[PDB]
Amino acid sequence: DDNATNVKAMKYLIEHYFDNFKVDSIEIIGSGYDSVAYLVNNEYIFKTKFSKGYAKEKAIYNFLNTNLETNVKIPNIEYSYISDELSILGYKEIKGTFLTPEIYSTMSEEEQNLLKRDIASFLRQMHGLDYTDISECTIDNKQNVLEEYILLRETIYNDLTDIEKDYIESFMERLNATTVFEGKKCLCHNDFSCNHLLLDGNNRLTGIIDFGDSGIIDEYCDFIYLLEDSEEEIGTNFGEDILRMYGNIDIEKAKEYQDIVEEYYPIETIVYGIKNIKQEFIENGRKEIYKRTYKD
Ligand SMILES: Nc1nc2c(ncn2[C@@H]2O[C@H](COP(=O)(O)OP(=O)(O)NP(=O)(O)O)[C@@H](O)[C@H]2O)c(=O)[nH]1
Ligand SMILES: NC[C@H]1O[C@H](O[C@H]2[C@H](O[C@@H]3O[C@H](CO)[C@@H](O)[C@H]3O)[C@@H](O)[C@H](N)C[C@@H]2N)[C@H](N)[C@@H](O)[C@@H]1O
Ligand SMILES: [Cl-]
Ligand SMILES: [Mg+2]
Ligand SMILES: [Mg+2]
Numbered sequence: 590d591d592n593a594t595n596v597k598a599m600k601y602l603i604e605h606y607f608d609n610f611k612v613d614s615i616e617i618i619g620s621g622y623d624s625v626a627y628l629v630n631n632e633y634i635f636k637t638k639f640s641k642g643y644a645k646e647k648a649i650y651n652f653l654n655t656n657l658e659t660n661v662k663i664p665n666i667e668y669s670y671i672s673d674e675l676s677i678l679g680y681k682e683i684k685g686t687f688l689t690p691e692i693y694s695t696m697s698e699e700e701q702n703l704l705k706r707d708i709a710s711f712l713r714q715m716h717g718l719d720y721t722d723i724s725e726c727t728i729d730n731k732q733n734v735l736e737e738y739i740l741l742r743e744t745i746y747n748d749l750t751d752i753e754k755d756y757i758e759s760f761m762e763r764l765n766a767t768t769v770f771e772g773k774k775c776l777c778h779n780d781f782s783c784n785h786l787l788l789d790g791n792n793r794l795t796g797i798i799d800f801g802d803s804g805i806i807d808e809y810c811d812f813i814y815l816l817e818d819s820e821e822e823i824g825t826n827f828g829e830d831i832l833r834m835y836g837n838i839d840i841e842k843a844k845e846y847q848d849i850v851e852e853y854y855p856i857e858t859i860v861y862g863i864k865n866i867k868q869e870f871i872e873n874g875r876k877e878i879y880k881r882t883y884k885d
């Protein structure tokens with residue numbers, strides 16, 4: 590019994606904290622580096638974490654369920670337990686199939702267009718919300734990076750190689766010269782990748798999950814994965830078309846914003862390692878810097 594034990598513990602905690610909730614079945618459906626999500630009674634999702642723990646995400650679902658006008662479904666929190674050492678959010682599973690590159694490639698041109706229009710429409714509607722009632726949830730990525738650079742300088746920066754230092758400094762120089770943080774701010778999903786997008790039986794967008802990183806931030810943020818060229822995402826043209834449908838936005842700046850975030854990735858990974866005292870992340874990030882430096 591490996592997998593069997595985690596599930597038992599979480600079944601115990603769910604029943605203990607949610608007085609009249611009976612767990613008849615429970616399985617792991619996903620996990621991050623510091624969280625685990627479970628499917629319970631083939632009906633409920635329970636996102637859990639042993640903290641930095643789930644209060645903001647819940648506030649955002651509550652704000653969005655009150656204010657969004659859309660047929661696209663999002664989580665609606667029925668159960669929550671939030672404490673310093675433990676957080677749990679429960680909601681009814683949104684039913685559907687996650688969008689993937691393989692699926693997209695089987696769709697007709699028209700089906701692809703309609704999906705793109707759906708996404709644009711959802712983003713336009715969310716970005717247009719008056720965010721006053723969630724004003725607390727502001728995120729300044731540039732300032733966050735500066736603070737993370739300071740933490741590097743205070744911890745391991747001096748032990749890095751010249752090549753690692755150069756990569757970091759060359760990123761900081763670019764950050765200082767860019768104008769992409771100076772545009773429209775709005776409420777963004779802020780992790781808007783196709784593993785969070787659900788399709789219904791006609792390949793239309795039916796739901797969106799994981800607003801855990803959402804906040805008032807640069808409008809460009811919600812396009813960075815839609816613009817990404819990788820195995821996990823659909824491709825740059827997909828993001829471009831969505832941008833054109835969404836309208837009133839500088840595409841070249843959206844791409845610059847995406848490229849800068851991408852350049853930061855290995856540094857983000859290093860910083861996560863430092864803050865969470867996980868050496869393997871520090872090592873992975875540094876190695877990634879070498880791989881990027883040597884790519885022709
Ligand atoms: N079909 C379906 N799957 C969901 C739903 N909610 C969660 N999941 C599944 O559970 C996984 C984990 O959920 P998610 O919100 O993305 O959280 P996380 O990124 O792992 N954790 P965190 O946001 O704390 O870093 C998703 O990849 C998906 O497999 C839902 O409503 N419907
Ligand atoms: N799983 C490996 C992939 O990681 C990154 O992309 C994923 C992404 O990871 C972030 O990407 C940023 C750098 O672009 C960072 O902030 C990451 O945290 C994740 O947050 C999204 N929900 C899904 C994205 N596909 C990379 N962009 C991509 O090139 C790479 O293939
Ligand atoms: Cl290391
Ligand atoms: Mg997720
Ligand atoms: Mg998340």
